[PDB]
Amino acid sequence: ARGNEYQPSNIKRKNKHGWVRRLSTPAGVQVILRRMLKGRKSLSH
Template sequence: MFVVSKLLSIVSRTSFQAPVSAPGGLYDTFVRYNIRNHFPRPSERKRIKVHGWKKRMSTPGGQRVIMRRILKGSYVYTH
């Protein structure tokens, strides 16, 4: 009986709490990272190495590119 009352108290406490919102910011960005299958096949590794998130964030110019795309409202920031 104690276990049931404890379980009901936990359920009642959690059901009436406000939902926790997900953290926002740069961690919720959409980045293209899927390898595409085109013919003739382009160099997908080179595309990601040159235009990818890690490369953009590693240089001040790349950070400016990402910030410009964020301010523009683009859905995809990098490849």
């Protein structure tokens, strides 16, 4: 019954966790900055 909470859809993925949305707010900008500081290969989704 449970487990398949992920129902992939690229539109939702990009609109929810995309570079544009992360830059859209100061909090998302700080998220990107934290990932950059940590050295993440993938800054956004």
